[PDB]
Amino acid sequence: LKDKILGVAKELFIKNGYNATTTGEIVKLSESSKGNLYFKTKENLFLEILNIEESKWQEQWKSEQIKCKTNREKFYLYNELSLTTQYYYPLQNAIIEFYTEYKTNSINEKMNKLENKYIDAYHVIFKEGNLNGEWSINDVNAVSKIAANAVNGIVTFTHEQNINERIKLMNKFSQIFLNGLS
Amino acid sequence: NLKDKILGVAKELFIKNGYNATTTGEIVKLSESSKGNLYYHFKTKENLFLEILNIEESKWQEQWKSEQIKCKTNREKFYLYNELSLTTQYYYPLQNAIIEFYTEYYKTNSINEKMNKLENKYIDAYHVIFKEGNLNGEWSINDVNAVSKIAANAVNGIVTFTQNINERIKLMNKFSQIFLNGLS
Numbered sequence: 166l167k168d169k170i171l172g173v174a175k176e177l178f179i180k181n182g183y184n185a186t187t188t189g190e191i192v193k194l195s196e197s198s199k200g201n202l203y204f205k206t207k208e209n210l211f212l213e214i215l216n217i218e219e220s221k222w223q224e225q226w227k228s229e230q231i232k233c234k235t236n237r238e239k240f241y242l243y244n245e246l247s248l249t250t251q252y253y254y255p256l257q258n259a260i261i262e263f264y265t266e267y268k269t270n271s272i273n274e275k276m277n278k279l280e281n282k283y284i285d286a287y288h289v290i291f292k293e294g295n296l297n298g299e300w301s302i303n304d305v306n307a308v309s310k311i312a313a314n315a316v317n318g319i320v321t322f323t324h325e326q327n328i329n330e331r332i333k334l335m336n337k338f339s340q341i342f343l344n345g346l347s
Numbered sequence: 348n349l350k351d352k353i354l355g356v357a358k359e360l361f362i363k364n365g366y367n368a369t370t371t372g373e374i375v376k377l378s379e380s381s382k383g384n385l386y387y388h389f390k391t392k393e394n395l396f397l398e399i400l401n402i403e404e405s406k407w408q409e410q411w412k413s414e415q416i417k418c419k420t421n422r423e424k425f426y427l428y429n430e431l432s433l434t435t436q437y438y439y440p441l442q443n444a445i446i447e448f449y450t451e452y453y454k455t456n457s458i459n460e461k462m463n464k465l466e467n468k469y470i471d472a473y474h475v476i477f478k479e480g481n482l483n484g485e486w487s488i489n490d491v492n493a494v495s496k497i498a499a500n501a502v503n504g505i506v507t508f509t510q511n512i513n514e515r516i517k518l519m520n521k522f523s524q525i526f527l528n529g530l531s
């Protein structure tokens with residue numbers, strides 16, 4: 166079908182790189198043709214998968230974040246869940262590889278809002294945290310970008326070692342980060 | 348020198364054309380050598396590439412040995428190190444062949460082993476900063492090895508996932524400030 170493609174494309178982009186998987190591989194792997202595949206281009210197809218996963222993850226987060234009473238806990242839990250989740254973070258190396266290629270100003274308007282979904286989770290947390298008076302952050306957008314990028318760092322660059330080690334580190338991080346604010 | 352020339356030539360080939368594009372044939376003929384010699388020294392292209400990365404790690408470590416004199420205190424060394432890691436990758440030419448390589452073999456497990464030995468060397472930079480910082484009462488960290496792994500991966504996330512260079516530096520410096528503050 167049409168959305169037999171998006172599922173296989175996703176799995177290819179994870180299995181191999183952005184560059185390593187091509188429009189020939191995906192079309193061949195879905196019993197289709199370039200007529201079918203023509204989405205616009207590879208860059209769009211990819212960027213649409215990015216859209217799906219980023220939503221799926223933020224939705225999974227919203228249906229799991231009630232378990233965090235304070236925002237201070239929401240920070241730990243969000244970063245913690247990021248290690249375990251099935252969404253978005255498994256596409257990160259392809260996202261790294263993708264940035265180095267496309268540069269092109271046509272598509273990078275779309276990178277502006279998808280870079281802002283990525284950080285909004287923290288923005289909500291730090292803003293609602295200043296409303297709740299758990300901390301005094303004057304520079305939230307700065308901090309939201311930092312925390313987001315740190316965490317993706319730990320998730321991505323530790324994807325090999327034991328999952329409890331990873332979860333241990335990530336929690337020690339959140340502890341050191343939040344303590345840094347006060 | 349036929350080992351070092353191969354690594355030299357390999358490096359520049361990898362830079363110009365990328366990892367996947369560079370063939371051992373090229374590496375062989377351009378360094379005035381042979382498949383035999385390349386096999387004897389590196390076995391694979393993958394391993395050759397790792398040996399390059401090894402030499403690069405060493406040089407980075409030698410650079411940092413000299414650069415860290417600009418930081419009297421470890422608080423300062425922490426700030427600086429992270430900044431260098433950010434600024435130097437903005438114009439690090441191998442970075443593309445690395446990304447290519449990393450993603451091409453992070454599925455593969457044997458390669459994944461030796462990469463650890465390599466990343467571990469990069470973490471030591473922080474281990475030393477944090478160790479020495481304990482001994483001068485800059486902070487009190489019980490779990491140094493941990494916080495060193497943490498620092499390293501957080502810093503490299505900020506570097507890898509981010510637009511004008513000043514804002515980046517200002518951000519990274521904020522992170523260093525926040526992180527370093529939350530140990531008191």
Ligand SMILES: CCNc1cc2oc3c/c(=[NH+]\CC)c(C)cc-3c(-c3ccccc3C(=O)OCC)c2cc1C
Binds near residue numbers: 400410
């Ligand atoms: C004049 C500047 N000189 C250097 C700058 C460098 O910048 C680097 C930036 C990086 N990222 C920024 C996005 C990464 C990942 C590795 C880098 C290395 C590096 C490359 C291969 C193996 C190890 C390292 C290394 O330094 O340690 C990591 C194991 C590196 C090496 C040198 C000599």
